Amino acid sequence: MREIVHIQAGQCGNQIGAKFWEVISDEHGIDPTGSYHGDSDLQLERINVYYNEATGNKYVPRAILVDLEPGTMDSVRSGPFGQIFRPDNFVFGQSGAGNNWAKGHYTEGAELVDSVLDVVRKESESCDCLQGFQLTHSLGGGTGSGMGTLLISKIREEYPDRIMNTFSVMPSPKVSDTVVEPYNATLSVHQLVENTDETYCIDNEALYDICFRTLKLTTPTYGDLNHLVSATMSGVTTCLRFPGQLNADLRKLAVNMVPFPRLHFFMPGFAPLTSRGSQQYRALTVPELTQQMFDSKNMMAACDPRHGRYLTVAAIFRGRMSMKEVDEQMLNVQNKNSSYFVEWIPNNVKTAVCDIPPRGLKMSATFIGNSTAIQELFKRISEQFTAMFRRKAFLHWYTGEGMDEMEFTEAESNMNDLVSEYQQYQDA
Amino acid sequence: SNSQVTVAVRVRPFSKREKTEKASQVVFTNGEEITVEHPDMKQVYSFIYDVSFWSFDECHPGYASQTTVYETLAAPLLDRAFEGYNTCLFAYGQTGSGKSYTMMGLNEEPGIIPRFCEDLFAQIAKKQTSEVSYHLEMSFFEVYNEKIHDLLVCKGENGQRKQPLRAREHPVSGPYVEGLSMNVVSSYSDIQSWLELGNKQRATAATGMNDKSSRSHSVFTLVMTQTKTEVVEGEEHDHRITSRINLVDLAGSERCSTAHSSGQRLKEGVSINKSLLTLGKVISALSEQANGKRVFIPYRESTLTWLLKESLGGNSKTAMIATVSPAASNIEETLSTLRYATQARLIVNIAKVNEDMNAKL
Amino acid sequence: MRECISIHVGQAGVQIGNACWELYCLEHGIQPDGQMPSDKTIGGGDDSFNTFFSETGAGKHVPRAVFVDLEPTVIDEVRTGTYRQLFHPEQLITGKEDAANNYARGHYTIGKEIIDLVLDRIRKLADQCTGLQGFLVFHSFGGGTGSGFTSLLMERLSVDYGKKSKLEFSIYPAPQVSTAVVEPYNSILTTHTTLEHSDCAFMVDNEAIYDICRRNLDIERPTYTNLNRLISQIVSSITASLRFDGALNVDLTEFQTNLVPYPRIHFPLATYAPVISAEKAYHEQLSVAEITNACFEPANQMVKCDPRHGKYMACCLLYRGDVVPKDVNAAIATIKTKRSIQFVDWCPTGFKVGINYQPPTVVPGGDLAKVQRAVCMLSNTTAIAEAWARLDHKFDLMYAKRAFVHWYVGEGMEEGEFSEAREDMAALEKDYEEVGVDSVE
């Protein structure tokens, strides 16, 4: 069987993963004691994609946590679903990075990545056939970028043939929650695009717009944003855990959605999202979802697709539905909005279906899309970055931990070349 | 401000071991055009290249000996190297096609390299005056599973050791290798020693093809520095000139699938073929970059390209030659080369859309 | 004896085979547990035939088939459904990992370590068979397993066994619809080898069955289960001559004889009589003439390929149920009178005929109806050129930019194994253009 590890780094990852497990456990019917209390045998035919087994019919996740400095270690442990995690896997250190990519890549992370990779190996070699790895880290910050990219660069050396799938929170355009976002994000993208197969670029302003406009929520906290990102995380693997009429897996997405290797920066999405009152007036069918997926606002990535072209699209579905309706609607989209798709590929959409839906819904979906619009993000940084580099604003903190300007220029000229590789195909 | 490619080929003659078995010829030529007809007589593929070296029979006109290959391919690289431009030459052919007789040669019939180098030193000793000076450094490194290694270094008195050589992008001078040796050379008797010290440490292995099959790309750089500029109000050079020559040997596009390869030999044919694909993409991008079409040139997908962003592209001049065999037992081995070098299509059915008309006041 | 082997590959293969073996177990009065109360009551007859279901001593019955996917989620649904007790437990879940919708994995880097068990099982099933043989591979183009494993198995079965019939009842890709984007490359690479090592490959197109389902049976929201039952009925119409009795029987060798003129033009099309729903089962006679006219009526073809833009080179017609041959002859002559159905000059004979007295069956949970007669047509036409060239163009648009290759060179496929196949299909696009030319002195 196919199996996944879940590395979980930073103040976003160590908060996302708790929500992700508090979501999958509800799918596989696990309680925070690790025991099972479900109702369907399908939950345990293929539970081993994520969970291992303990002695007394308990189940424990293959979660690794890397920089749980006690403010977050305790926050997970003093929580509902914190008891199940393996304590030897709660790795941590002290004297954190402090919003510094270097302190999380060169100096402190180098002292701890050995201890982390030991847990990675000890968990992997228990698996029968590894399919890939995951990660959920923040960019612009220090540790989620540094330690995450370090672990990636070392894992892909040890385990090159396998998948590595980093679900990252990229910086926001307008409201920056950190003034060293561009340096760290650039230096991380310099190490992600080379040493990664697919990564899904989430952004927070788009999720805030999604939660304020579509769900009509007046008090959106971070846990409600993670509550979405987790749904996507689960919708990506429903084809791997549960059965359907046309299965799929992460390798299929990484094959069909990555025509060229460097163009593996994606825009995810998830249907149907609606308010608690406005669920009485919405018909739950396929075309409603398909409309709510290709909309510019369900985009979690903060990039209007209509400004560019979708090189490739993948749609995972969950529920007892048809295959003709799916194909018909996707063909209608390929034929109506022809300009928003590419010409040198005649079909730019694929499908995957699971015949077992989410616990409280009848039929959901998950969207992945590679576009030329995402370059906007890496254009913004390449305007934010260089202005800081000319007058060398936040530079001394990054030289003082063993770096140089040269590396930064490498990262800049690996971002801008990729922006050009995107912009090659959006004119005509 | 254009470029060229100048793809070419070379059809060897039968070896005696293959001439006594009465092996059937499968490669004919019509001047510029080349063709490949099976022994079964159901299909005939016909290709067209900018150059065609027909080395089958000494009686045929248009006989392309070693010196012909020199004067046709290598001397313009020599010229542009003097004119302050960087040059890059490639040699391709699967095992048995005799790349070595085309590049290096024999001690009675030379190849390209030594003719090129001796014309270099003769032109130097001709132009060598008190004002001008010429300084030459060299290097000979490889690529193996996308990792960089140096063949020129004498290996440490050690076990099996993979080297820490990694790439770095200077913002101006371009990409380079961190820690690569650069030895100086004056006469060819030294460069021969350096190359023969290099090749022995190369990555090779045995297969169904032969015991001697290369499994790592080779790059051989010659950096030439001209020092002529001298200031009149004082002894100072306003500028120097530097030209980078890069002669390159490629690995054969193994079909791992038909060789029942498994393990470390399967992790090479996957890297080799990747580098060849990126190289073909890059050259097919350059050939369009000569025709005014603005496109992207992915020098980043492969190290063999990333180290050559400056040489392959710009005010430079690439070059290629591809060795094939005319025997009817190496047909699928051969045609791939003929289909890998399909970068001589520059005026083949281009469309047309022009809007500028009668511009006036 | 008269026996066949049925192989299935991939999710498409298993999802066809489940319907097929459901139908077979329904026809012979078999229950899902291999047993027969019908023979226990009757006390005679070969009803659970030795052609598909072999026989142990306890009255049980065991299929002459296996299936492999490299994708356990399908077979493990057979090992937990209604039909877990029927099959031999050797359904090859070697699915420690999928074949990534690519041909390189299925043909070499994930087909290694799996195929040998399949050859062992095929030998074990062949040695149980004392006579006639023939393999029915149910696979799929575009997909990686259904392409790679099919190629790697057929090139080995042309080696070990050789002079037997091998028939591929595969799913062609639709030109507009498709559930993938790497479909054409894998399709072409499969064709490159299955033009040699196979003997006749019947094709279908899921868009065609979608149109057939909405237009005739009045089904707006189908599923693949509603299609695979039509396909099982196709196969049953093929095989009724071998299992059951009838006037004119057509053995597997005759299909590959009469419909394959030249060795490279063995890619025909198929159809049935699904103008037949339960409400419209009334209001219609369903004679032989009407169905023989319908089988050539476009929008009922199971491959979207307008034949009027091309020509027919051969046809076979296999009838079930109550048929009197003079009706068959009147029907065939009614087609030969028409001019919108062009034939080649060199096949004036045109048609093969097969008749079987057993009618079809009716799966409970079915969209079709009970009929006293039913038809299956299998035609070889030049029009499928238009069905190839589309996949020949999409390829040429994409391969020019060398997209989607790095995943395939990642698993041993060369850059130059593509053009070696594209030119093969260029030849096959010519050997459908020379066959449709009328001879001249």
Ligand SMILES: CC(=O)O[C@H]1C(=O)[C@@]2(C)[C@H]([C@H](OC(=O)c3ccccc3)[C@]3(O)C[C@H](OC(=O)[C@H](O)[C@@H](NC(=O)c4ccccc4)c4ccccc4)C(C)=C1C3(C)C)[C@]1(OC(C)=O)CO[C@@H]1C[C@@H]2O
């Ligand atoms: C009466 C009723 O149907 O309640 C629904 C509900 O009202 C709606 C609005 C639910 C509700 O979702 C939210 O309230 C919400 C809040 C913040 C951020 C995101 C969602 C619901 O909370 C969410 C919850 O959905 C699920 O439970 C899914 O299984 C989801 N899992 C969880 O939400 C979950 C969260 C914590 C712990 C355990 C499970 C899921 C689905 C697929 C993959 C991963 C997770 C459901 C059915 C509902 C409520 C409960 C109201 C919706 O949920 C989702 C993610 O699709 C919001 O839009 C759908 C449509 C549902 O109608």
Ligand SMILES: Nc1nc2c(ncn2[C@@H]2O[C@H](COP(=O)(O)OP(=O)(O)OP(=O)(O)O)[C@@H](O)[C@H]2O)c(=O)[nH]1
């Ligand atoms: N007719 C029919 N076709 C199906 C069915 N299920 C899947 N397919 C076809 O299968 C194709 C998708 O690839 P598959 O053949 O399933 O490949 P696979 O079985 O998943 O094996 P891999 O390629 O290794 O993943 C599509 O073109 C579908 O048309 C089915 O139930 N009936």
Ligand SMILES: Nc1nc2c(ncn2[C@@H]2O[C@H](COP(=O)(O)OP(=O)(O)O)[C@@H](O)[C@H]2O)c(=O)[nH]1
């Ligand atoms: N979606 C989400 N983002 C978060 C959360 N917590 C922090 N972040 C983001 O993470 C970034 C800060 O990164 P941080 O983890 O503090 O840096 P690090 O400690 O060095 O890894 C900010 O831009 C936040 O938007 C969370 O709970 N949810």
Ligand SMILES: Nc1ncnc2c1ncn2[C@@H]1O[C@H](COP(=O)(O)OP(=O)(O)O)[C@@H](O)[C@H]1O
């Ligand atoms: N133009 C030529 N005339 C005569 N012999 C040639 C010619 N080109 C190649 N050969 C023969 O080919 C042989 C070299 O093949 P080899 O170098 O082993 O293949 P590879 O270059 O792939 O290693 C030489 O021994 C040489 O005799």
Ligand SMILES: [Mg+2]
């Ligand atoms: Mg599959």
